[PDB]
């Protein structure tokens, strides 16, 4: 039938954008790699260049040290056997010290010391990366929204392995490094605390997560449906409203009685998504610090 604008029909190549001008320090820029036919059927096909500054080397090194530290430990539990390593990759686990060890670093390597060492490497990798998201935007003159939205994810992460364990008294409250075990930790956390469905900040966290799918499904379908008016060039539609922005808004006005602007829809979108981990981190932080049983706490105050 009609063209749907789901896969590009004809692909075009020119000289790659080196992205001169602005304040990006091209000393830390790589060359530009291959182009992908495969990628070009759905989005852009230009791979690279990447910006690798000092802050990105730091991130990437301690990032690998985190990964390799868990890897060694995983091999050690495999008894250095390659066949066992594969048979149990999803079952291995690097775990924090036992409850008796408190907030201490004296824990021996095989009894949680390694977990502290990996978590130091993680801690450095995520934070120096956060500095990258603020600096790359700074270099191009852009706004800081990406860094601030990143800060919402780092909040939940920080609460899980670091803020809540400290306020609890022991590293053993923190999350293990393993595929299935982190799942097991999640199910137990809800049991120990009397059914997280009854943590109202978990319910908010779910409304925003479902809503983020609702919102992104509406916004993607809506921009693809007015792409025939060049609707994906949204910044110009913000600079100079076209028929694309007007048809889009009128569809929603006519359907549910109100509507967005070409700029404003991205405010809805950044807040929908950000509030998933903002409310999530709060819910976790109060669990066991201030509320031990959410279902019981629910009865005493409303529902």
């Amino acid at each position: 039938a009609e063209y749907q604008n789901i896969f590009t029909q004809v692909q075009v190549r020119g000289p790659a954008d080196l992205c001169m001008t602005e304040d990006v320090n091209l000393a830390n820029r790589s060359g530009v790699g291959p182009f992908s036919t495969l990628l070009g059927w759905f989005g852009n096909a230009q791979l690279g260049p990447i910006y690798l500054g000092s802050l990105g080397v730091l991130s990437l090194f301690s990032g690998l040290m985190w990964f390799f530290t868990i890897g060694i430990w995983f091999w050690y539990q495999a008894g250095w056997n390659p066949a066992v390593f594969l048979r149990d990759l999803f079952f291995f686990s690097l775990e924090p010290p036992a409850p008796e060890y408190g907030l201490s670093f004296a824990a021996p390597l095989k009894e949680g010391g390694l977990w502290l060492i990996a978590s130091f490497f993680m801690f450095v990798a995520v934070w120096s990366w956060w500095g990258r998201t603020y600096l790359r935007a700074q270099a191009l003159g852009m706004g800081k929204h990406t860094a601030w939205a990143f800060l919402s994810a780092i909040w939940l992460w920080m609460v899980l392995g670091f803020i809540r364990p400290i306020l609890m008294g022991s590293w053993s409250e923190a999350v293990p490094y393993g595929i299935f075990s982190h799942l097991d930790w999640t199910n137990n956390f809800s049991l120990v605390h009397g059914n997280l469905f009854y943590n109202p900040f978990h319910g908010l966290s779910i409304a925003f997560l479902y809503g983020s799918a609702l919102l992104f499904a509406m916004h993607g379908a809506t921009i693809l449906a007015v792409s025939r008016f060049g609707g994906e060039r949204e910044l110009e539609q913000i600079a100079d409203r076209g028929t694309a922005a007007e048809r889009a808004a009128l569809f929603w006005r006519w359907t549910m009685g109100f509507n967005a602007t070409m700029e404003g829809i991205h405010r809805w979108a950044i807040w929908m998504a950000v509030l998933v981990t903002l409310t999530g981190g709060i819910g976790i932080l109060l669990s066991g610090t201030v509320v031990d049983n959410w279902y019981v706490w629910g009865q005493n105050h409303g529902m």
Partner: protein, 242 residues
Amino acid sequence: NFDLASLAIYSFWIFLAGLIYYLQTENMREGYPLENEDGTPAANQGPFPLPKPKTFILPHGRGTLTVPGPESEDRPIALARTAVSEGFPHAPTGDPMKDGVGPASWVARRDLPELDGHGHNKIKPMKAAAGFHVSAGKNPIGLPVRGCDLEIAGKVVDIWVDIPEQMARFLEVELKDGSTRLLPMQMVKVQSNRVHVNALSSDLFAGIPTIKSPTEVTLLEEDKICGYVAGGLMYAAPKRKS
């Protein structure tokens, strides 16, 4: 009885009511105040105020837009009120395709081309874009272009491409009388032997509005070209069969 967790969730719902009110006013920077069907301001405007104005500064010295401000359609709207009371359709008083109303509407945008990062024309046809060519899929240049009546209207003679974003946004088609019009990429179905267009029949390509230049299109010309073409889906319906 009144926990810190209790205090936190009451706080959060209060922040939420303020965030929603803020977000709503931000999306009232275009189109508002609401109007009555006669163009004068409507009494009942909702319980959210209009937002205080803000300003964008267009690059390459193209001025400053400030929203919200005074709205003007900036063009003649060829439609008649049909109803004593509000809420009814409005009738095209002409050729709605040629007059630019209904699914054929366009917007009075600036009569300039969009400009990329270094200040160059954002859309240039391949014949003038220093460096560009075709890289995957069926190359449409040369192919015949065919409408919803199943007759041919001309041939693809070029592609107008996005320079910074590297994608094809228009086909340039040459007509039986030797002039050219732009076809929006989204509105065509490129095939192995032809290029098919459900939007228009062969005889309505000649009415795609025309550009004041052979290697630049303007934002106001883009709105006219694209609104016309999608309006064919409704207004060229008598041609369409099968």
